[PDB]
């Protein structure tokens, strides 16, 4: 019978966040939304203590949580069991983009509204995917290692060092992030750009890439839709995952699909870790069939023993692994965007106007409100 | 009174090169030019033993060297002293691009011709410079470290993690590589692109970037020439070096010029290591004033104790250092290009037609033949 609770789970930044106000996505700085939440008579409970269910600080504040705020880089998994003891939950907001860590179906069954700050990090992840591509293709790991450990073995680096130019790049998903990856690839003079999704790209999108290809490289018709998944990964040197975890996309990048790729190919996954068969990825990196890079993991924070943390090609420890901890969507520039985004969503809710941006809505009124989840 | 000698100094790749025929830039594979050299009655002496002067295999074969072939990634320093005991030297060819390791003035005084495979690696280095930018700005080092050493400290990565978008990129040199860096930056939505050289860019080059800016980002007039060097580095978040080591460019990026940059700026140098004051770079990285990345060093191979091998920002060992061993110009795709390039230069010379590509000529007939050196 207390005040209504806003329960927010973010990662902790300690003294770093206390001295860097731009680290808004931290428990310390609370996205800057404390004044607003208290202006409207709500109790703001912010915590980084999100696991051991059901003993966490997060779990213990579920019974009076009206609004739940999470963040994908350090995500409180809002499962059916947890939704079942949050009886007055009305709204879930993701501080960022990516809401697979909710049980969206159980939330619909309760009429729960689910919002994201769609578009706050689309450019940031696209930069991360391009960086990953460049790091793997050009063998930055061994090139940096040679400089770090005092030697000068040019041939060890160059033996696995390829240009981006004249490679074939394929993307599973040409949405906001996927398409933005294609855009930044054009000036690298690819041999061909492939894409695979359930609907064909718009025309002016195909025309924009072809126009860019013509201006930069004098090449035309560089983009092409492949409709068979095995056919897409067979033709490509580099495949990026830029689609969502939507149930039948569970584990789609499995042992068989990896086997259909050329030996020495590259897999980038800044989308969702669970799109892959995680051990099949590790097997294929450690065998040298592929190199792998990305920042999303199947379980976050990732276990110490997670096989992706020690994957490498046979050539050496610094060959073929460009993993990072989940950071692309939470650069300082991105954090400013989605902190302001969470503030606008809460303002609309508190003022009881609910004039949300429609692209921000993931679930509402008991139904999905987007193709990005299901 | 033996046959005339072709003296070639390349790096060694051992069993790697013996099993990878694409490693043409190695002693093992000899650029594929042995048949041609012997077809014309020449003795091909290939060696990776290039230092201790005057005792090296390289030095000991100078007295009968007619053609000298070097490579910048592992360069035999053809100094005045060494030219003085190569009395029948006629031609020096660089297996790649970058000929600062010759004494070009002493070669002119002898009428020595000096050739490069201009353009063989322009795209490869531009990819390396962009990769370096992305690695430093986005804090890949700590992001990769966190994943490697079993932890999950999101805030440590994000505290120094910025987007490429809305940053100001400045290039010292808008030649083939510099301009190609600008081209690949456009789709990253920069705030502004600056450049600094002795002559203004052509018009259709300015128009190509502005056209690309308009198509991708809806922005116009994105390129701008700055004429004061301190003024260029004051305004920029990222400055790339893409000009040559031409005597008064010796040590230009010194303590003072670094001090004029904003704290937390970035310096990329895929050009020549000696463009910088090397210890001033180390001082400014270790103090955190800048981050630094690149693959060229003042002395190659770099000493074990070279300060750039252990530079890092105060935040940690994996902050602010993106050094690699000199590899960008020697990717497998690049090696195929400049091995064929060295073959054409030798064909023209052996057939005594000398129909060299004019862009390949660095010195000839006692004079410089390019603005890229002097
Ligand atoms: N690493 C990070 O920090 C970070 C940050 C934000 C987001 N993300 C991840 O990136 C993902 C999407 O990014 P976004 O916001 O750009 O998504 P988006 O804008 O919704 O675009 C997704 C695209 O993927 C396509 N797609 C959907 N299901 C597919 C399937 N099964 N196979 C192939 N293509 C499919 C969709 O087209 P059709 O509907 O026509 O198939 C759509 O065009 C999110 O799910 C999230 O997991 C990561
Ligand atoms: N890392 C690698 O593997 C690798 C491979 C190849 C080359 N490189 C390096 O990259 C350098 C050049 O690359 P490139 O082949 O693209 O050269 P380039 O085509 O000759 O272009 C050089 C540009 O720099 C400008 N410039 C010359 N001197 C300058 C100065 N003092 N200050 C500012 N700008 C100046 C020139 O314009 P103005 O004459 O109008 O000033 C010219 O436009 C080479 O010197 C080499 O050291 C590295």
PDB file of N, CA, C and O in Angstrom, chain A residues 274-332:
ATOM      1  N   UNK A 274      21.568 -15.686 -29.375  1.00  0.00           N
ATOM      2  CA  UNK A 274      20.777 -16.908 -29.480  1.00  0.00           C
ATOM      3  C   UNK A 274      20.331 -17.217 -30.903  1.00  0.00           C
ATOM      4  O   UNK A 274      19.720 -18.271 -31.120  1.00  0.00           O
ATOM      5  N   UNK A 275      20.604 -16.338 -31.871  1.00  0.00           N
ATOM      6  CA  UNK A 275      20.360 -16.685 -33.266  1.00  0.00           C
ATOM      7  C   UNK A 275      21.216 -17.865 -33.704  1.00  0.00           C
ATOM      8  O   UNK A 275      20.845 -18.591 -34.634  1.00  0.00           O
ATOM      9  N   UNK A 276      22.356 -18.068 -33.055  1.00  0.00           N
ATOM     10  CA  UNK A 276      23.283 -19.137 -33.386  1.00  0.00           C
ATOM     11  C   UNK A 276      23.080 -20.348 -32.483  1.00  0.00           C
ATOM     12  O   UNK A 276      22.461 -20.270 -31.419  1.00  0.00           O
ATOM     13  N   UNK A 277      23.607 -21.480 -32.941  1.00  0.00           N
ATOM     14  CA  UNK A 277      23.929 -22.610 -32.081  1.00  0.00           C
ATOM     15  C   UNK A 277      25.286 -22.289 -31.466  1.00  0.00           C
ATOM     16  O   UNK A 277      26.318 -22.455 -32.128  1.00  0.00           O
ATOM     17  N   UNK A 278      25.323 -21.817 -30.214  1.00  0.00           N
ATOM     18  CA  UNK A 278      26.571 -21.225 -29.695  1.00  0.00           C
ATOM     19  C   UNK A 278      27.754 -22.177 -29.700  1.00  0.00           C
ATOM     20  O   UNK A 278      28.876 -21.757 -30.014  1.00  0.00           O
ATOM     21  N   UNK A 279      27.539 -23.451 -29.368  1.00  0.00           N
ATOM     22  CA  UNK A 279      28.643 -24.405 -29.384  1.00  0.00           C
ATOM     23  C   UNK A 279      29.051 -24.762 -30.809  1.00  0.00           C
ATOM     24  O   UNK A 279      30.225 -25.058 -31.060  1.00  0.00           O
ATOM     25  N   UNK A 280      28.105 -24.735 -31.752  1.00  0.00           N
ATOM     26  CA  UNK A 280      28.453 -24.969 -33.150  1.00  0.00           C
ATOM     27  C   UNK A 280      29.327 -23.845 -33.692  1.00  0.00           C
ATOM     28  O   UNK A 280      30.214 -24.085 -34.520  1.00  0.00           O
ATOM     29  N   UNK A 281      29.084 -22.612 -33.244  1.00  0.00           N
ATOM     30  CA  UNK A 281      29.955 -21.498 -33.609  1.00  0.00           C
ATOM     31  C   UNK A 281      31.361 -21.735 -33.071  1.00  0.00           C
ATOM     32  O   UNK A 281      32.356 -21.589 -33.791  1.00  0.00           O
ATOM     33  N   UNK A 282      31.459 -22.099 -31.789  1.00  0.00           N
ATOM     34  CA  UNK A 282      32.759 -22.362 -31.179  1.00  0.00           C
ATOM     35  C   UNK A 282      33.489 -23.489 -31.898  1.00  0.00           C
ATOM     36  O   UNK A 282      34.691 -23.390 -32.173  1.00  0.00           O
ATOM     37  N   UNK A 283      32.778 -24.581 -32.194  1.00  0.00           N
ATOM     38  CA  UNK A 283      33.382 -25.689 -32.931  1.00  0.00           C
ATOM     39  C   UNK A 283      33.940 -25.224 -34.270  1.00  0.00           C
ATOM     40  O   UNK A 283      35.050 -25.608 -34.656  1.00  0.00           O
ATOM     41  N   UNK A 284      33.186 -24.394 -34.992  1.00  0.00           N
ATOM     42  CA  UNK A 284      33.588 -23.973 -36.326  1.00  0.00           C
ATOM     43  C   UNK A 284      34.688 -22.921 -36.312  1.00  0.00           C
ATOM     44  O   UNK A 284      35.432 -22.813 -37.293  1.00  0.00           O
ATOM     45  N   UNK A 285      34.805 -22.142 -35.237  1.00  0.00           N
ATOM     46  CA  UNK A 285      35.935 -21.230 -35.106  1.00  0.00           C
ATOM     47  C   UNK A 285      37.198 -22.001 -34.745  1.00  0.00           C
ATOM     48  O   UNK A 285      38.269 -21.780 -35.322  1.00  0.00           O
ATOM     49  N   UNK A 286      37.085 -22.925 -33.788  1.00  0.00           N
ATOM     50  CA  UNK A 286      38.256 -23.659 -33.323  1.00  0.00           C
ATOM     51  C   UNK A 286      38.790 -24.603 -34.392  1.00  0.00           C
ATOM     52  O   UNK A 286      39.980 -24.938 -34.383  1.00  0.00           O
ATOM     53  N   UNK A 287      37.933 -25.042 -35.315  1.00  0.00           N
ATOM     54  CA  UNK A 287      38.376 -25.844 -36.448  1.00  0.00           C
ATOM     55  C   UNK A 287      38.947 -25.001 -37.580  1.00  0.00           C
ATOM     56  O   UNK A 287      39.577 -25.556 -38.485  1.00  0.00           O
ATOM     57  N   UNK A 288      38.743 -23.686 -37.553  1.00  0.00           N
ATOM     58  CA  UNK A 288      39.219 -22.813 -38.602  1.00  0.00           C
ATOM     59  C   UNK A 288      38.291 -22.661 -39.785  1.00  0.00           C
ATOM     60  O   UNK A 288      38.644 -21.958 -40.741  1.00  0.00           O
ATOM     61  N   UNK A 289      37.117 -23.296 -39.757  1.00  0.00           N
ATOM     62  CA  UNK A 289      36.185 -23.167 -40.870  1.00  0.00           C
ATOM     63  C   UNK A 289      35.676 -21.740 -41.018  1.00  0.00           C
ATOM     64  O   UNK A 289      35.439 -21.281 -42.141  1.00  0.00           O
ATOM     65  N   UNK A 290      35.503 -21.023 -39.904  1.00  0.00           N
ATOM     66  CA  UNK A 290      35.052 -19.637 -39.928  1.00  0.00           C
ATOM     67  C   UNK A 290      35.800 -18.835 -38.873  1.00  0.00           C
ATOM     68  O   UNK A 290      36.429 -19.382 -37.966  1.00  0.00           O
ATOM     69  N   UNK A 291      35.723 -17.516 -39.017  1.00  0.00           N
ATOM     70  CA  UNK A 291      36.038 -16.572 -37.959  1.00  0.00           C
ATOM     71  C   UNK A 291      34.739 -15.928 -37.494  1.00  0.00           C
ATOM     72  O   UNK A 291      33.783 -15.808 -38.264  1.00  0.00           O
ATOM     73  N   UNK A 292      34.702 -15.513 -36.230  1.00  0.00           N
ATOM     74  CA  UNK A 292      33.460 -15.035 -35.642  1.00  0.00           C
ATOM     75  C   UNK A 292      33.718 -13.796 -34.801  1.00  0.00           C
ATOM     76  O   UNK A 292      34.738 -13.697 -34.114  1.00  0.00           O
ATOM     77  N   UNK A 293      32.778 -12.857 -34.861  1.00  0.00           N
ATOM     78  CA  UNK A 293      32.881 -11.628 -34.100  1.00  0.00           C
ATOM     79  C   UNK A 293      31.515 -11.037 -33.847  1.00  0.00           C
ATOM     80  O   UNK A 293      30.557 -11.287 -34.585  1.00  0.00           O
ATOM     81  N   UNK A 294      31.437 -10.245 -32.791  1.00  0.00           N
ATOM     82  CA  UNK A 294      30.178  -9.674 -32.362  1.00  0.00           C
ATOM     83  C   UNK A 294      30.240  -9.331 -30.890  1.00  0.00           C
ATOM     84  O   UNK A 294      31.229  -9.595 -30.205  1.00  0.00           O
ATOM     85  N   UNK A 295      29.150  -8.730 -30.411  1.00  0.00           N
ATOM     86  CA  UNK A 295      29.093  -8.293 -29.026  1.00  0.00           C
ATOM     87  C   UNK A 295      27.905  -8.840 -28.246  1.00  0.00           C
ATOM     88  O   UNK A 295      27.832  -8.610 -27.036  1.00  0.00           O
ATOM     89  N   UNK A 296      26.996  -9.568 -28.879  1.00  0.00           N
ATOM     90  CA  UNK A 296      25.823 -10.104 -28.198  1.00  0.00           C
ATOM     91  C   UNK A 296      26.063 -11.571 -27.881  1.00  0.00           C
ATOM     92  O   UNK A 296      26.690 -12.299 -28.663  1.00  0.00           O
ATOM     93  N   UNK A 297      25.571 -12.007 -26.729  1.00  0.00           N
ATOM     94  CA  UNK A 297      25.788 -13.344 -26.210  1.00  0.00           C
ATOM     95  C   UNK A 297      24.449 -13.969 -25.857  1.00  0.00           C
ATOM     96  O   UNK A 297      23.461 -13.257 -25.644  1.00  0.00           O
ATOM     97  N   UNK A 298      24.376 -15.304 -25.792  1.00  0.00           N
ATOM     98  CA  UNK A 298      23.088 -15.940 -25.468  1.00  0.00           C
ATOM     99  C   UNK A 298      22.613 -15.658 -24.054  1.00  0.00           C
ATOM    100  O   UNK A 298      21.399 -15.590 -23.823  1.00  0.00           O
ATOM    101  N   UNK A 299      23.527 -15.492 -23.102  1.00  0.00           N
ATOM    102  CA  UNK A 299      23.193 -15.206 -21.711  1.00  0.00           C
ATOM    103  C   UNK A 299      24.092 -14.072 -21.245  1.00  0.00           C
ATOM    104  O   UNK A 299      25.317 -14.151 -21.383  1.00  0.00           O
ATOM    105  N   UNK A 300      23.487 -13.016 -20.703  1.00  0.00           N
ATOM    106  CA  UNK A 300      24.230 -11.822 -20.331  1.00  0.00           C
ATOM    107  C   UNK A 300      23.956 -11.483 -18.870  1.00  0.00           C
ATOM    108  O   UNK A 300      22.784 -11.349 -18.474  1.00  0.00           O
ATOM    109  N   UNK A 301      24.998 -11.334 -18.036  1.00  0.00           N
ATOM    110  CA  UNK A 301      26.428 -11.379 -18.385  1.00  0.00           C
ATOM    111  C   UNK A 301      26.877 -12.783 -18.774  1.00  0.00           C
ATOM    112  O   UNK A 301      26.318 -13.771 -18.307  1.00  0.00           O
ATOM    113  N   UNK A 302      27.879 -12.896 -19.636  1.00  0.00           N
ATOM    114  CA  UNK A 302      28.257 -14.211 -20.130  1.00  0.00           C
ATOM    115  C   UNK A 302      29.052 -14.965 -19.068  1.00  0.00           C
ATOM    116  O   UNK A 302      29.864 -14.364 -18.359  1.00  0.00           O
ATOM    117  N   UNK A 303      28.819 -16.269 -18.925  1.00  0.00           N
ATOM    118  CA  UNK A 303      29.600 -17.056 -17.963  1.00  0.00           C
ATOM    119  C   UNK A 303      31.091 -16.946 -18.238  1.00  0.00           C
ATOM    120  O   UNK A 303      31.520 -16.681 -19.364  1.00  0.00           O
ATOM    121  N   UNK A 304      31.883 -17.137 -17.181  1.00  0.00           N
ATOM    122  CA  UNK A 304      33.333 -17.127 -17.335  1.00  0.00           C
ATOM    123  C   UNK A 304      33.775 -18.206 -18.318  1.00  0.00           C
ATOM    124  O   UNK A 304      34.665 -17.977 -19.147  1.00  0.00           O
ATOM    125  N   UNK A 305      33.137 -19.372 -18.269  1.00  0.00           N
ATOM    126  CA  UNK A 305      33.520 -20.515 -19.084  1.00  0.00           C
ATOM    127  C   UNK A 305      32.874 -20.521 -20.465  1.00  0.00           C
ATOM    128  O   UNK A 305      32.936 -21.545 -21.153  1.00  0.00           O
ATOM    129  N   UNK A 306      32.252 -19.421 -20.880  1.00  0.00           N
ATOM    130  CA  UNK A 306      31.534 -19.414 -22.148  1.00  0.00           C
ATOM    131  C   UNK A 306      32.513 -19.666 -23.291  1.00  0.00           C
ATOM    132  O   UNK A 306      33.543 -18.983 -23.380  1.00  0.00           O
ATOM    133  N   UNK A 307      32.242 -20.637 -24.168  1.00  0.00           N
ATOM    134  CA  UNK A 307      33.248 -21.027 -25.172  1.00  0.00           C
ATOM    135  C   UNK A 307      33.651 -19.907 -26.116  1.00  0.00           C
ATOM    136  O   UNK A 307      34.750 -19.963 -26.679  1.00  0.00           O
ATOM    137  N   UNK A 308      32.804 -18.893 -26.309  1.00  0.00           N
ATOM    138  CA  UNK A 308      33.159 -17.797 -27.202  1.00  0.00           C
ATOM    139  C   UNK A 308      34.286 -16.935 -26.648  1.00  0.00           C
ATOM    140  O   UNK A 308      34.936 -16.219 -27.416  1.00  0.00           O
ATOM    141  N   UNK A 309      34.532 -16.988 -25.336  1.00  0.00           N
ATOM    142  CA  UNK A 309      35.586 -16.177 -24.739  1.00  0.00           C
ATOM    143  C   UNK A 309      36.983 -16.688 -25.072  1.00  0.00           C
ATOM    144  O   UNK A 309      37.954 -15.941 -24.912  1.00  0.00           O
ATOM    145  N   UNK A 310      37.107 -17.935 -25.532  1.00  0.00           N
ATOM    146  CA  UNK A 310      38.407 -18.523 -25.824  1.00  0.00           C
ATOM    147  C   UNK A 310      38.481 -19.160 -27.205  1.00  0.00           C
ATOM    148  O   UNK A 310      39.497 -19.791 -27.521  1.00  0.00           O
ATOM    149  N   UNK A 311      37.428 -19.045 -28.015  1.00  0.00           N
ATOM    150  CA  UNK A 311      37.489 -19.402 -29.428  1.00  0.00           C
ATOM    151  C   UNK A 311      38.724 -18.805 -30.089  1.00  0.00           C
ATOM    152  O   UNK A 311      39.093 -17.659 -29.823  1.00  0.00           O
ATOM    153  N   UNK A 312      39.356 -19.585 -30.965  1.00  0.00           N
ATOM    154  CA  UNK A 312      40.331 -19.033 -31.896  1.00  0.00           C
ATOM    155  C   UNK A 312      40.611 -20.047 -32.993  1.00  0.00           C
ATOM    156  O   UNK A 312      40.433 -21.254 -32.812  1.00  0.00           O
ATOM    157  N   UNK A 313      41.052 -19.529 -34.139  1.00  0.00           N
ATOM    158  CA  UNK A 313      41.453 -20.369 -35.251  1.00  0.00           C
ATOM    159  C   UNK A 313      42.721 -21.144 -34.899  1.00  0.00           C
ATOM    160  O   UNK A 313      43.492 -20.729 -34.031  1.00  0.00           O
ATOM    161  N   UNK A 314      42.945 -22.291 -35.549  1.00  0.00           N
ATOM    162  CA  UNK A 314      44.165 -23.071 -35.272  1.00  0.00           C
ATOM    163  C   UNK A 314      45.453 -22.278 -35.411  1.00  0.00           C
ATOM    164  O   UNK A 314      46.436 -22.592 -34.727  1.00  0.00           O
ATOM    165  N   UNK A 315      45.482 -21.263 -36.282  1.00  0.00           N
ATOM    166  CA  UNK A 315      46.701 -20.488 -36.496  1.00  0.00           C
ATOM    167  C   UNK A 315      47.215 -19.830 -35.224  1.00  0.00           C
ATOM    168  O   UNK A 315      48.394 -19.461 -35.166  1.00  0.00           O
ATOM    169  N   UNK A 316      46.382 -19.673 -34.212  1.00  0.00           N
ATOM    170  CA  UNK A 316      46.812 -19.017 -32.995  1.00  0.00           C
ATOM    171  C   UNK A 316      45.657 -18.411 -32.226  1.00  0.00           C
ATOM    172  O   UNK A 316      44.548 -18.239 -32.726  1.00  0.00           O
ATOM    173  N   UNK A 317      45.948 -18.085 -30.965  1.00  0.00           N
ATOM    174  CA  UNK A 317      44.969 -17.513 -30.046  1.00  0.00           C
ATOM    175  C   UNK A 317      44.354 -16.223 -30.577  1.00  0.00           C
ATOM    176  O   UNK A 317      43.178 -15.945 -30.314  1.00  0.00           O
ATOM    177  N   UNK A 318      45.122 -15.419 -31.312  1.00  0.00           N
ATOM    178  CA  UNK A 318      44.651 -14.129 -31.793  1.00  0.00           C
ATOM    179  C   UNK A 318      44.188 -14.180 -33.246  1.00  0.00           C
ATOM    180  O   UNK A 318      44.186 -13.149 -33.927  1.00  0.00           O
ATOM    181  N   UNK A 319      43.794 -15.356 -33.728  1.00  0.00           N
ATOM    182  CA  UNK A 319      43.247 -15.530 -35.069  1.00  0.00           C
ATOM    183  C   UNK A 319      41.767 -15.877 -34.965  1.00  0.00           C
ATOM    184  O   UNK A 319      41.405 -16.871 -34.326  1.00  0.00           O
ATOM    185  N   UNK A 320      40.919 -15.064 -35.589  1.00  0.00           N
ATOM    186  CA  UNK A 320      39.549 -15.457 -35.849  1.00  0.00           C
ATOM    187  C   UNK A 320      38.541 -15.187 -34.754  1.00  0.00           C
ATOM    188  O   UNK A 320      37.384 -15.601 -34.893  1.00  0.00           O
ATOM    189  N   UNK A 321      38.931 -14.517 -33.672  1.00  0.00           N
ATOM    190  CA  UNK A 321      38.015 -14.166 -32.594  1.00  0.00           C
ATOM    191  C   UNK A 321      38.029 -12.653 -32.426  1.00  0.00           C
ATOM    192  O   UNK A 321      39.060 -12.076 -32.070  1.00  0.00           O
ATOM    193  N   UNK A 322      36.887 -12.020 -32.677  1.00  0.00           N
ATOM    194  CA  UNK A 322      36.700 -10.594 -32.434  1.00  0.00           C
ATOM    195  C   UNK A 322      35.485 -10.363 -31.545  1.00  0.00           C
ATOM    196  O   UNK A 322      34.652  -9.489 -31.796  1.00  0.00           O
ATOM    197  N   UNK A 323      35.368 -11.160 -30.485  1.00  0.00           N
ATOM    198  CA  UNK A 323      34.285 -10.968 -29.532  1.00  0.00           C
ATOM    199  C   UNK A 323      34.513  -9.702 -28.720  1.00  0.00           C
ATOM    200  O   UNK A 323      35.650  -9.347 -28.397  1.00  0.00           O
ATOM    201  N   UNK A 324      33.424  -9.011 -28.394  1.00  0.00           N
ATOM    202  CA  UNK A 324      33.433  -8.030 -27.322  1.00  0.00           C
ATOM    203  C   UNK A 324      32.240  -8.260 -26.411  1.00  0.00           C
ATOM    204  O   UNK A 324      31.220  -8.828 -26.812  1.00  0.00           O
ATOM    205  N   UNK A 325      32.403  -7.835 -25.166  1.00  0.00           N
ATOM    206  CA  UNK A 325      31.311  -7.651 -24.220  1.00  0.00           C
ATOM    207  C   UNK A 325      30.279  -6.705 -24.837  1.00  0.00           C
ATOM    208  O   UNK A 325      30.628  -5.850 -25.658  1.00  0.00           O
ATOM    209  N   UNK A 326      29.005  -6.849 -24.458  1.00  0.00           N
ATOM    210  CA  UNK A 326      27.901  -6.179 -25.155  1.00  0.00           C
ATOM    211  C   UNK A 326      27.955  -4.678 -24.897  1.00  0.00           C
ATOM    212  O   UNK A 326      27.505  -4.197 -23.855  1.00  0.00           O
ATOM    213  N   UNK A 327      28.494  -3.927 -25.858  1.00  0.00           N
ATOM    214  CA  UNK A 327      28.754  -2.503 -25.658  1.00  0.00           C
ATOM    215  C   UNK A 327      28.303  -1.622 -26.813  1.00  0.00           C
ATOM    216  O   UNK A 327      28.176  -0.399 -26.621  1.00  0.00           O
ATOM    217  N   UNK A 328      28.057  -2.152 -28.016  1.00  0.00           N
ATOM    218  CA  UNK A 328      27.900  -1.291 -29.190  1.00  0.00           C
ATOM    219  C   UNK A 328      26.758  -0.298 -29.009  1.00  0.00           C
ATOM    220  O   UNK A 328      26.912   0.899 -29.274  1.00  0.00           O
ATOM    221  N   UNK A 329      25.604  -0.777 -28.557  1.00  0.00           N
ATOM    222  CA  UNK A 329      24.459   0.084 -28.330  1.00  0.00           C
ATOM    223  C   UNK A 329      24.576   1.042 -27.162  1.00  0.00           C
ATOM    224  O   UNK A 329      23.660   1.844 -26.961  1.00  0.00           O
ATOM    225  N   UNK A 330      25.659   0.987 -26.383  1.00  0.00           N
ATOM    226  CA  UNK A 330      25.773   1.791 -25.171  1.00  0.00           C
ATOM    227  C   UNK A 330      27.006   2.693 -25.187  1.00  0.00           C
ATOM    228  O   UNK A 330      27.552   3.035 -24.135  1.00  0.00           O
ATOM    229  N   UNK A 331      27.435   3.116 -26.373  1.00  0.00           N
ATOM    230  CA  UNK A 331      28.397   4.205 -26.453  1.00  0.00           C
ATOM    231  C   UNK A 331      27.801   5.466 -25.830  1.00  0.00           C
ATOM    232  O   UNK A 331      26.582   5.614 -25.710  1.00  0.00           O
ATOM    233  N   UNK A 332      28.685   6.379 -25.418  1.00  0.00           N
ATOM    234  CA  UNK A 332      28.234   7.597 -24.751  1.00  0.00           C
ATOM    235  C   UNK A 332      27.233   8.366 -25.607  1.00  0.00           C
ATOM    236  O   UNK A 332      26.248   8.904 -25.090  1.00  0.00           O
TER     237      UNK A 332
END
